[model samples]
Target: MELPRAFGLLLHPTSLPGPYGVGVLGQEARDFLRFLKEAGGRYWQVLPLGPTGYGDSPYQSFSAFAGNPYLIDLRPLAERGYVRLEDPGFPQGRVDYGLLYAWKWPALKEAFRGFKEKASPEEREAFAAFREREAWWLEDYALFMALKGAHGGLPWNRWPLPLRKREEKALREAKSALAEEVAFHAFTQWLFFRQWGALKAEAEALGIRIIGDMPIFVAEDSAEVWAHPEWFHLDEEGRPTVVAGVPPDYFSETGQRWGNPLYRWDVLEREGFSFWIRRLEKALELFHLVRIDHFRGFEAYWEIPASCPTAVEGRWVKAPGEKLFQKIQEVFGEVPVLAEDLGVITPEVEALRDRFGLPGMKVLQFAFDXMENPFLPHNYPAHGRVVVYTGTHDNDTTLGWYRTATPHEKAFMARYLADWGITFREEEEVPWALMHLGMKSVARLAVYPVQDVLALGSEARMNYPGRPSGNWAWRLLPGELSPEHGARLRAMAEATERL
Candidate 1:
């Protein structure tokens, strides 16, 4: 679908400021929306909003369909007398996930207790309705989480045979035994969706739209895998037979092994692609636009043996991408999808993306290779065919990128910009220059991370691809982004006709 020329910011909700250990769906989120509008942004792009699991990566979530309970604001619960506010004296600039869990889980349990005892009939009915409407995925997710908790947070595959294999009798008895725990998980979900709905409506009221993300593959230990063994390439013992990853490239001698469960495409095809349909349908419901991470994987993916320590033993496998997308179109006509066609894209991948008229991505950080580099604004595909960015969640902040850039890349960027009548005297000005270039590009949307907007360095970088921890912890200190930043953003947007 052709998107209107617009501007946006890429910021996961976890990075928003709050008094708690991390950002939540609270006042701070609303304030961020207002700031986006003030800055003339039409889209607010976010990472996957699912409950993160091991390593605290949003991509490695516990459930594909469940909202992150960590992002739910407890202030509303406190106001309702369900929880008493406490200041654990959380550090202001980074999310402390462990500290957050210690404080948040108990407060949520307390709120659930108050809700069960004191909620009005109408409120109770609303919660019940939510459960019923989302029962398709919610039931499995709630049960999976409760069981995981009971099993000391071990992955479902590691659970006992009856439970791991989902024996009917065991499941029936476990539901009876873990009824309260299951209910608590359900309650957290209700709170999360309620807050999300309100936040979405607020953005809509202000003429802003949200752009959410969905990974191409699900984590091996995710609720989806646990609930639907038939949908993935799993061994008899419920372990992945083959996993997802990319083959070695210039970036690394040993390619990255993502360890996500690969789908059993034949099974999916036999099932009429219901799994993908449901996933995309839910994603569309949550955001105005949905960006599919690793869009090339839809066309062809690298399948790695589960025993491989690295991505060296992977082989390319063709996927039924066209057929799948055709099914999606049949279900949701002309749906909004942004294809993240980065890295080793082939003609087949480009063809798949173009066939659906899905816009691909271009990052300014990737443009210094040469004048012919497609990431450069001037070299982009026809207008409205792509989304341009100064950088994305996975890249270093623009300032940090320049600081560590090879001498050739830095000089190339300077020369290339000068050729285009853009010049900057200081390294600090590099990010703004790129931002300006992104806004002026013919791409349909120009989105940037808040770090680039604030000219932050490595300290504010959101993620490092191979790093296990210390990623996804950066938080925006309260009021760190001032009105001046908004004004500057708006002026750039207006100058570039992005408004």
Candidate 2:
């Protein structure tokens, strides 16, 4: 997708500074949009906005169509005469998802009850329309969650025989028995959608567009797999026969056993890619541009046997990339997508990306070691149709990386900077210098994590790919984002001709 010369910050809504245990879609989000405008930023990149499931990772959302209920700000609901929910006594600086998971639902349930009782006729009309229009996914997702609750949050595959197999009789009975539970899930989704629309409008007023994420594979335990088992290579018990992963790269020696269900591509094509189109349309509604995580998978993916412990034994399987994109184009012409062509990219993948006119990514953190590295700013294509990053969520904070890097690597970085007459002594100055290099690159867009912009350390890094827990918990602190930061950011933004 074509974009103007621009710069943005990569900060998930969960990382925004706030008092609600997690960053929410209220005043803080609006104020941050305003701050981005003040800092001359044209984009606000976020991870997938879907409701995270078992791993607390957005990539593994419960439903591709649902927003994270935890991101719903109670402030607006309260002001509109919903239940009077208050803070859960969470610490001011960081989120405790355990506390949020414990307290958020009961409070939201009460709020839903109050809304049903007291919301105006107009409000009810809007809610009804939202449900009716989104019934395609909403009804299934609501019932899915309702059944999840009944099964004590166990994955659908682990449910009772009838439910696990999605028998018609069992589903009818479950939906009827769990009617209110199902409605509550729908109600929460309505709340999220409504607030998200308002927030997106505010961001638009500031001339900042959202850059959203779309993971290539669906989690085995996700609503997508549960709702449409035919789309995946699932066994009789609805278990994935083949799981998703990547070959060993810079990230992990064993590769990431993502454990997502591999697609039954022929089934998708038989359906004219209708399900995938709906997913993409929903994403485009919420964001101006969607970055497909693991874009290389569209060309070929590493298929690991379901019982494998590591990706070392996986084999590459060819995918129907051209056909899928053709179908997507037929549905939505000239789709706005960015390729996360980071790991295990082959020439075939690059050809697919270029054929579709999709911009790929460049990470400065991965560039210093090799002259042939396309991630190097100096190697950026002359046409400037790519997004460059100081580092990404999966990467260490630039400072964190520098601290742990080999002496040889550190010397190379320092020497490279010296060659450009850009030397810095203070550790505090390092991140900014690296960020400046990316912003000054010829890439169409330059993105920096809020952590990197804050000059934070490894403690503030968003994710470490191989680890299961202790990830995605970093939060931006209050009073930390200041006019000074905005001014400095604006300086680089203008200096780089992004303004």
Candidate 3:
């Protein structure tokens, strides 16, 4: 999986500027791609595109194989005569998730109805083809969403025993009862793929490749867990026997308890890893490269008891990494994968990554902790098999981080990049220094957050590791990106030989 010697910016689709509350797969996305092209960027990276659940985190989604209905471009549907522009008036600014459900859902429902009523013969044929093409996952996902709605959006585990356990008779009866709702969910997915395909094609014309993220664990409430209970380590009552989490580390005294259901690797192997292969295939269709979140989980995962209150009590459980990758390669030939190898990396995890020739990631912000840290530019591998970043979605913007650093840390950081002659006094200079360090490093790919480039503070941070509320709400204002910003970024890229 060879990569171009170029740089990219990390900006999720939801963060793009738009008038319909949060951003959608609309004109704003096309405009962003145009900006990327003008700035000489080769890659456009985004977070997971799954439907967010409970915590508004993309990682915790309702379905691994389904698209987020929230991301559907209503404007495009209306243009195509599937919906009317005057269908509803959605509130502007930050997404009102509550109002979104109340107003948007009904409007979408109307659009679905219109499509069925007025679709031409050609359109009907295309829709049928899409349904048949994705039937493997679409059938189960549609039923799962319909059932969730029926249960008032409660977790699947709380459903009645017959349906929760997925007895065949109960499933058939439920499908029959919720036929219309099931079709509605499936129709929403159809529109999402249609719009996303157009956007990807437009980006390709601009020579920009997309890098999509995939979280290793799926939410316990997701369609994947509900459809195939045997593939997860769930008890007879549909509760996790062992959950996913991280042990206490530098970030927190009480480690983060993610509560995702751990995979049953043994069963997955028995089934020839078909589900995972399909997942990767779907991802590759949408992205040129995929970033695997929590990549260390492949070597070993932190397992916590389902009843535990915090992640402090978790212990590492062995996983079959080599076998999984081997199966994946057999099914999908030579897929490009980026390992998010962060946090307590061990020799075994490195061995797994190296065995598959998958690239790991390095964060420059982590380097300032110690001179000997592998994340430091001086310690970078010469093989160019790593992706470097100034900071990631979870970390503070470089400028925001510098303001809070102690005097000693700041002094060390300034000295490390003294060749650039940047001082620690100016707030905006910190991110610039960090970006320079990343671009000049030997890593094959360099990515910086859009917030860092915009010189925003912690106020624009995407997510905090332990905190749950008011996260993933940041949005870029319309016309905030200026010609000066693009010119400066292009100059930097050209200077570092990244253009």
In model 2, the Cα lDDT at residue 146 comes to 91
Work out the TM-score per prediction. Answer: 0.99, 0.97, 0.96
Model 3 C-alpha lDDT per residue in residues 362-404, reported as the tens digit of each score: 9887777656889887787877888999899998888778778
Q: Is candidate 2 or candidate 3 better by TM-score?
A: 2
Every candidate's CA RMSD: 1.0, 1.3, 1.7
Any idea what lDDT model 1 has?
A: 0.90
The C-alpha stretches of model 1 lying farther than 4 A from their native spots are: none
lDDT of each: 0.90, 0.86, 0.86
Error of 3 at 181 (Å): 0.8
lDDT of 3 at 462: 85
lDDT head-to-head 1 vs 2, winner:
1
The global Cα lDDT (0 to 1) of model 3 is: 0.86
- In model 3, the Cα lDDT at residue 193 comes to 91
Poorest stretch of ten by lDDT in candidate 2: 412-421
Across residues 1-499, which tens digit of lDDT does each residue of candidate 1 receive? 6588899999999999878788999899999999999989999999999988878899999988999999999998988888787878898789988888888888889999988888899999999999999999998999999998789989999999999999899998898999999999999999998899999999999889999999999988888899899999999889998999899988789988999999989789988988888888898778989999999998899999999899999789989999999988988998698989888889999988999989999989988955778888888886567899988999999999999999999999988787767789899999999898888779889999999988999999889999888999999999998899999999999999998
Worst window of 10 by summed lDDT in candidate 3: 85-94
The TM-score-based order of candidates, best leading, equals 1, 2, 3
